[PDB]
Amino acid sequence: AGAGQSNDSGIVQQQSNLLRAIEAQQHLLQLTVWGIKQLQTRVLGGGGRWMQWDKEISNYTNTVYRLLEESQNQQERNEKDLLALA
Amino acid sequence: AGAGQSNDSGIVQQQSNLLRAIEAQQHLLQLTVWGIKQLQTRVLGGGGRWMQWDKEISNYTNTVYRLLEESQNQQERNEKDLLALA
Amino acid sequence: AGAGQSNDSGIVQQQSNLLRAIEAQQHLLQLTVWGIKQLQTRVLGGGGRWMQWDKEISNYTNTVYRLLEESQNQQERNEKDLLALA
């Protein structure tokens, strides 16, 4: 009962934790993309398949962004709902 | 009570969100591996430590895959169980 | 009721699953950083912006680590709390 609330609070906290981890990993991913681009641009050039790659990176980066936004909104909703619990 | 159900529904939705985010990040990871392979193959060759790297990438990619599969199954189970709630 | 416990157990299991996935992806990330470093060191050298990059990678890697540690602790707490449920 009170046991239930504490558990729920712990699970909601845990979702915040995991969201935070995925966010930091997204920044790591973008840092790796930067490094690869610095090498590809310098070593390879040249265009074409790398244009495919660039757009593919962009597409997936944007879906992660949208997912993280949706997850942020859901997190605040969940935290609000947790706080209204009897 | 009904408050509890809404919270639970929100937490389950949140797990789906995070699963989706991790899936998209996995695709980003594979895109970065592709780019690194394109450079390594071209610049470095050559074999050996990069064979270690390739198998290491494969091993970890496979555990993520298996984890995502297990997570998908768990998600459907959770969603089924949520729906059976009184 | 018992329905509630099973759901909660499923959600806690699901958090463990996602934590595991993020952990494996972190190892993949470090493997990609290794490969990029092997190319940058060989092709580019040279220092400076790559020193920025190295510290940036380090900073974010450390926050993921700390987040994963915090998430591990939260997971054990949640699992303990789940087990004390009536």
Residue of B74, B64, B78, B70 whose CA lies nearest to B22: B64
- Give the orientation angle of helix B2-39 with respect to helix C2-39, to 10 degrees: 20
Whether C60 sits inside 8 A of A21 (CB atoms) is no
Q: How far is A82 from chain B (nearest CA, A)?
A: 7
Residue of B75, B60, B59 whose CA lies nearest to B19: B75
Which chain A residues touch C43 with a CB distance below 8 Å? 39, 42-43
Token duo for residue B62: 């496979």
Token duo for residue C59: 């900073």
**Alpha carbon distance A11, C67 (integer Å):** 15
Q: How far is CA C45 from CA B73, C40, C42, C53, C76, in A?
A: 46, 6, 6, 13, 44
Q: Which CATH class is domain A1-86?
A: mainly alpha
Token duo for residue C26: 């972190």
Residue B13 CA to its chain's centroid (Å): 17
Dihedral of alpha carbons C74, C78, C80, B66, sign: negative
Residue B1 CA to its chain's centroid (Å): 33
Where in chain B are the domains? 1-86
Residue position matching structure tokens 């297990």: B70
Q: Which residues are CB-neighbours of C16 under 8 A, at least 6 positions away?
A: C75, C79
DSSP A56-71: HHHHHHHHHHHHHHHH
Whether A25 sits inside 8 A of B24 (CB atoms) is no
Q: How far is CA C85 from CA A9, A49, B7, C67, in A?
A: 14, 55, 18, 27
Instruction: Name the experiment that determined this structure.
Output: X-ray
Whether A12 sits inside 8 A of B13 (CB atoms) is no
Token duo for residue C4: 């509630």
Q: What secondary structure letter does DSSP report for C86? A: -
Resolution (A): 1.8
Token duo for residue C2: 């018992």
A6, A83 Cβ separation under 8 angstroms: no
Whether B42 sits inside 8 A of A39 (CB atoms) is no
Which chain B residues touch C6 with a CB distance below 8 Å? 81
Burial of B70 (0-12, 13-18, 19+ CB in 10 A): middle
